[PDB]
Design a protein around this ligand. Sequence first.
Ligand SMILES: C[C@@H](CCc1ccccc1)Nc1c(F)c(Oc2cccc(C(=N)N)c2)nc(Oc2ccccc2C(=O)O)c1F
Ligand SMILES: C[As](C)(=O)[O-]
Ligand SMILES: [Ca+2]
Ligand SMILES: [Ca+2]
Ligand SMILES: [Ca+2]
Ligand SMILES: [Ca+2]
Ligand SMILES: [Ca+2]
Ligand SMILES: [Ca+2]
Ligand SMILES: [Ca+2]
Ligand SMILES: [Ca+2]
Lengths: 254, 195, 142
Amino acid sequence: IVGGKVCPKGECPWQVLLLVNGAQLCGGTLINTIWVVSAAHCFDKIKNWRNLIAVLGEHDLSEHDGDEQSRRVAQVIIPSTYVPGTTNHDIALLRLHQPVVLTDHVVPLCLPERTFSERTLAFVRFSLVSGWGQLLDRGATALELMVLNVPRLMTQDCLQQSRKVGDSPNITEYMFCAGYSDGSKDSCKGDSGGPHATHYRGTWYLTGIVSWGQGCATVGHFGVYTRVSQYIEWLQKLMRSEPRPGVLLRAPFP
Amino acid sequence: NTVAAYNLTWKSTNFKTILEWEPKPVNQVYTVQISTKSGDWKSKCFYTTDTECDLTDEIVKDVKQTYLARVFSYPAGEPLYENSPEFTPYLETNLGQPTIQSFEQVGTKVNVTVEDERTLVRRNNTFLSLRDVFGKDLIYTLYYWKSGKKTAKTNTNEFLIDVDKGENYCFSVQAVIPSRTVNRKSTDSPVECMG
Amino acid sequence: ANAFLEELRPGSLERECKEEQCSFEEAREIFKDAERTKLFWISYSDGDQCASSPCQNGGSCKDQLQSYICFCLPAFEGRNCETHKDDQLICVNENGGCEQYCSDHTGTKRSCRCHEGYSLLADGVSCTPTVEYPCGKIPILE
Ligand SMILES: C[C@@H](CCc1ccccc1)Nc1c(F)c(Oc2cccc(C(=N)N)c2)nc(Oc2ccccc2C(=O)O)c1F
Ligand SMILES: C[As](C)(=O)[O-]
Ligand SMILES: [Ca+2]
Ligand SMILES: [Ca+2]
Ligand SMILES: [Ca+2]
Ligand SMILES: [Ca+2]
Ligand SMILES: [Ca+2]
Ligand SMILES: [Ca+2]
Ligand SMILES: [Ca+2]
Ligand SMILES: [Ca+2]
């Protein structure tokens, strides 16, 4: 996170830490006890498929305070339409091998239904963004979970207020922009997959997956997030499907 | 398909704020949204075929705040939209035309009173007057003739001018907000003369 | 107005313009000066827009210069008090008042629902947790 604050222990309970071969990989979002939502791009150059661990209740990467729980991931499902190295459809669904236990420091974020998100949650300005990513472009990673509040933007605005970079990948209907254009705050490499949660009438919902941007907190560029609302029923259909053997699964979208 | 709205204009007088825009709907309907620079967007005028939206009840919750609005176009069979210029009520809302409440002759001095025209700002169901809203920022300006054209200024609603005990003077006032540089003066009221 | 032997008498704003309805000359015949007659006339001719009785549903109307202002009762709004706020109860409006999910309805009233782990209260809009760890809640703060 660039320009955020350390989230206090327990106030970002749906934050998951993805580890591959023991190393820190990406963030995620607990959606219930067995599933977590992440970004498809974290798995692009992953070779060790059965060496994927999901850690919850985590806060400080430099200590084990017995609040953290880890499970191995049995399945990562990405849309067949996603093309590695690119930008579109950057979403992944992981089936935890064993269900974690909801505790004071382990609670899932609510995955809303398409219309509530599309017509209601889409209009609350600020939403939270968190993770253990770089504290600035190419800078170091954080040890304690970091949070950031960022204002959402309609794509037309996002396009109207950004420096016209002739190589920038188009912002599709599967993503939305959010953050600041003055280079002060933004998600950053290492946070991908993490949650963008919107608060509404006493409850928190999953509205976006940290996905991409032109370098962290660049002037004239907002961070772009995966539009989770477009994948609600796809997410639902998959959570109802029997475990198709093999860890990776490129399910058809939709 | 649709066509994005355009020429979104704010029209405001005594806080009755109404957003207008073009064009006239032809196989499309509109929806408007309002918000302060950093607040959640509130939808008003749902699927309206009209080219205007009454935003008074929203803007009068804090007249000193700055609001931006947008107008969406939906096909009548993210959508297109256009943002409105920004509008800070307190500094841009038009001061209606004033109204001389009376003009009592006290000896050689004559007292002219301007009535506090009601604004749309409410408080406990009641409507605050222009003076409860602007306070010391509101200056009323009196014009009076006997061939002549004299003026006077007051930071209340009453004037006391020296009339030549010999003729029937005439009046007309103007509300002025000195601090402004935009819509700082109102249209002159209807002329009132002593019979 | 002008009667047989009235203009033999010097003009009068009440008698001629307030009492009776005057013309532009008659007013000019009174105020004498062009600009003085103009100033009076611009207000004397740009009528009472509230005459067409344009403010509906109980609103009051303040006339203006080729315009007016409507002051509406609490449950109404719009340029002429046409909008009934009581009728705006649709999901695209404050999530239809629903705490969580709002289902819009045509002839029927909007109906609220909830997310797994919550239950709709009796008020028909609120949701209460049915389980110890409902989804969008931070235990340490709750
Ligand atoms: C998705 C794809 C499209 C290609 C592309 C990449 C960049 C720009 C346009 C297209 N490419 C990528 C990203 F978009 C990306 O995005 C952001 C991630 C977080 C924050 C960002 C920000 N807000 N600045 C931007 N991070 C990427 O890699 C990481 C490298 C080092 C460490 C962590 C990384 C990671 O997290 O995956 C990456 F490969
Ligand atoms: C949203 As963009 C083009 O600034 O990166
Ligand atoms: Ca730890
Ligand atoms: Ca006459
Ligand atoms: Ca006459
Ligand atoms: Ca007469
Ligand atoms: Ca008469
Ligand atoms: Ca004459
Ligand atoms: Ca005459
Ligand atoms: Ca008039």
